[PDB]
Amino acid sequence: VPFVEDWDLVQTLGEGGEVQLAVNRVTEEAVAVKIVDMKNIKKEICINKMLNHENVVKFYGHRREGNIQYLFLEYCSGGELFDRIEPDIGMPEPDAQRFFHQLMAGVVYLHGIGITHRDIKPENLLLDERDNLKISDFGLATVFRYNNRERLLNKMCGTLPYVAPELLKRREFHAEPVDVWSCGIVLTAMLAGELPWDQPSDSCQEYSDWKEKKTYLNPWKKIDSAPLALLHKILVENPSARITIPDIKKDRWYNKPLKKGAKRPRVTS
Ligand SMILES: COc1cc2c(cc1OC)-c1[nH]nc(-c3ccc(-c4nnn[nH]4)cc3)c1C2
Structure with missing residues (x-):
């Protein structure tokens, strides 16, 4: 199945690097992509690979392109709990x-x-x-x-x-x-x-x-x-x-x- 691995960076979800909403070109599945400019991350990815629970953000995998590290994480359409607090x-x-x-x-x-x-x-x-x-x-x-x-x-x-x-x-x-x-x-x-x-x-x-x-x-x-x-x-x-x-x-x-x-x-x- 061609183009199934292509994701479009649709909008910004947060900062710190940055978190982007990524939409699959073929399936239109939404994921949150963490863009980490390395110039710590080894432990972060290691801990994330152990995690599998319904009340913990899903880790789908990671891809490294030179100095930029891409973390593929769960998209949560309800947003942050922070914005439910009046x-x-x-x-x-x-x-x-x-x-x-x-x-x-x-x-x-x-x-x-x-x-x-x-x-x-x-x-x-x-x-x-x-x-x-x-x-x-x-x-x-x-x-x-x-x-x-x-x-x-x-x-x-x-x-x-x-x-x-x-x-x-x-x-x-x-x-x-x-x-x-x-x-x-x-x-x-x-x-x-x-x-x-x-x-x-x-x-x-x-x-x-x-x-x-x-x-x-x-x-x-x-x-x-x-x-x-x-x-x-x-x-x-x-x-x-x-x-x-x-x-x-x-x-x-x-x-x-x-x-x-x-x-x-x-x-x-
Ligand atoms: C301000 O609005 C939003 C803000 C965020 C999301 C959705 C939002 O609106 C629906 C969304 N889905 N998933 C994340 C997300 C997932 C993982 C991580 C993360 N950071 N470090 N490791 N995992 C950060 C954000 C966000 C932020």
């Missing part, structure tokens, strides 16, 4: 619970194969055509468990409003509680439409107020008591005392019926 409002609680369930499935998977994303935020959480959440960008990702032996991290990685406090106060820390904390900050953004603090440090007043349990303040005043009880368990300063994903899965709000299924077409009489 500033200072957020989104309806049932939508946030469904996206948080899908985010947990994706992070469970990753941790299961010993991968830590290290930069979970709404900019990196993409939505497919049926609004299924997908974890994207393994540029900062790394192997924290190999041959069933855990390796402690020491490197500063992430985005300050989403990083766990141990990453700023300890030399070494465990990988999994760091991804749990960023998921908790994502849940806060989804239910309040604002970030609670610039960084989880004691010099940050908003962060001190949260440790002082001043929940009558923003963003916590906008969040219902059931998801707020969960956030109280996730945004715990001590990474050893922090809730683990198996226990998030037992939380009362996480298992609270709120959301209806996708609305299938119906007729009466």
